[PDB]
């Protein structure tokens, strides 16, 4: 197998194909072209709320585990608190009972717990997939959402897309990739981590196809 490369390199080469598929999914495609409504935006953000909540809960559970510990950046990355602000903004005071919890979202959340509870050595695959993506297309989707729905530059309703503790996401991404290469990595784990990364992308693709359908 390809163990002659660093985990960050293996992950990038392993997910580049499905990434193109995920990037050109119907829901994302629309969002990219400015075509994004309040109804849909609220659907995906509520979904991300449940997802990041599960991911970050598993991160806390395994924060001391060396298979993940070097990547424990709650202050800089975690989105749960940010998404809670966003839910209050979009759904109001009682968002805990108003926000949806779709099947595709539940599916994603279920795999997150399985990994965090049973296969924690794979958890890095899920943080990698979501966090780095946020740091890459984060400012892009944000500027689009603002132009489309008239969200003020002050950021209310888009806290999720804002990283106040990260000055340069590009530099941080570089740090995160390098830190990923310091994890205990056997040919067995690296092999499985890259596969789980694909699964994460697929889970994201399945969420989008589901939301797109709900909207149409
Ligand atoms: C959407 C756009 C416009 C985007 C662009 C984009 N993705 C990149 C990285 C990436 N983007 C992703 C992830 C994602 N990216 C995806 O489009 C989706 C749906 C995921 C989520 C599953 C990852 C993990 C990286 C890093 C690849 C690597 O450098 O290791 C880079 C290089 C850019 C600028 N990323 C965005 O999120
Ligand atoms: Fe991306």
Cβ density class 53-79: b for 16+ within 10 Å, e for less: bbbbebbeebeeeebbebbbbeebbbb
The owner of tokens 């919890």 is: 101
Is the distance from CB of 8 to CB of 16 less than 8 angstroms? no
Of all protein residues, the one whose alpha carbon is nearest to atom 11 of ligand 1 is: 133
Give the other-Cβ count within 10 Å of 115's Cβ: 23
What is the chain's Cα-based Rg?
A: 17
Listed by start position, the domains of the chain span 1-216
The owner of tokens 């050595």 is: 121
Of all protein residues, the one whose alpha carbon is nearest to atom 33 of ligand 1 is: 136
Question: Does 128 appear as a known binding residue?
Answer: yes
Strand locations in the chain, DSSP E? none
Tokens coding 91: 């759904």
Dihedral over Cα of 71, 72, 77, 79: its sign:
positive
Is the distance from CB of 48 to CB of 145 less than 8 angstroms? no
Is the distance from CB of 199 to CB of 207 less than 8 angstroms? no
The owner of tokens 């990038």 is: 12
DSSP symbol at 206: H
User: 1.10.10.60, 3.40.630.30, 3.40.50.720, 1.20.910.10: which CATH number matches 1-216?
Assistant: 1.20.910.10
Whole-number Å distance between alpha carbons of 150 and 122? 39
- What resolution in angstrom units was achieved for this structure? 2.4
Question: Does 78 appear as a known binding residue?
Answer: no
Tokens coding 195: 């596969």
Whole-number Å distance between alpha carbons of 205 and 196? 14
Whole-number Å distance between alpha carbons of 61 and 11? 24
Is the distance from CB of 99 to CB of 40 less than 8 angstroms? no
Give the other-Cβ count within 10 Å of 158's Cβ: 24
The owner of tokens 């070097």 is: 70
Mutation test residue for ligand 1: of 125, 133, 181, the one with most atoms within 8 Å of CB: 133
Task: Count CA within 13 A, CB hemisphere, residue 109.
Answer: 16
Is the distance from CB of 127 to CB of 58 less than 8 angstroms? no
């Amino acid at each position: 197998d390809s163990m002659s490369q660093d985990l960050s390199e293996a992950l990038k080469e392993a997910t580049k194909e499905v990434h193109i598929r995920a990037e050109n999914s119907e829901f994302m495609r629309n969002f990219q072209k400015g075509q994004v409504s309040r109804e849909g935006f609220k659907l995906v953000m509520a979904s991300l709320y449940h997802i990041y909540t599960a991911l970050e809960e598993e991160i806390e559970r395994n924060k001391q585990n060396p298979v993940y510990a070097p990547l424990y950046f709650p202050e800089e990355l975690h989105r749960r608190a940010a998404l809670e602000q966003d839910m209050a903004f979009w759904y109001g005071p009682h968002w805990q009972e108003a926000i949806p919890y779709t099947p595709a979202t539940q599916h994603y959340v279920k795999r997150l717990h399985e990994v965090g509870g049973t296969h924690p050595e794979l958890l890095v695959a899920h943080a990698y997939t979501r966090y780095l993506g946020d740091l890459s297309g984060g400012q892009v989707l944000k500027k689009i959402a603002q132009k489309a729905m008239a969200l003020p530059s002050s950021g209310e309703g888009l806290a999720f897309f804002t990283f106040p503790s990260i000055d340069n996401p590009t530099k941080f991404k570089q740090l995160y990739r390098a830190r990923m290469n310091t994890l205990e990595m056997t040919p067995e784990v690296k092999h499985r981590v890259t596969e789980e990364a694909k699964t994460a992308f697929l889970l994201n693709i399945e969420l989008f196809e589901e939301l797109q359908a709900l909207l149409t």
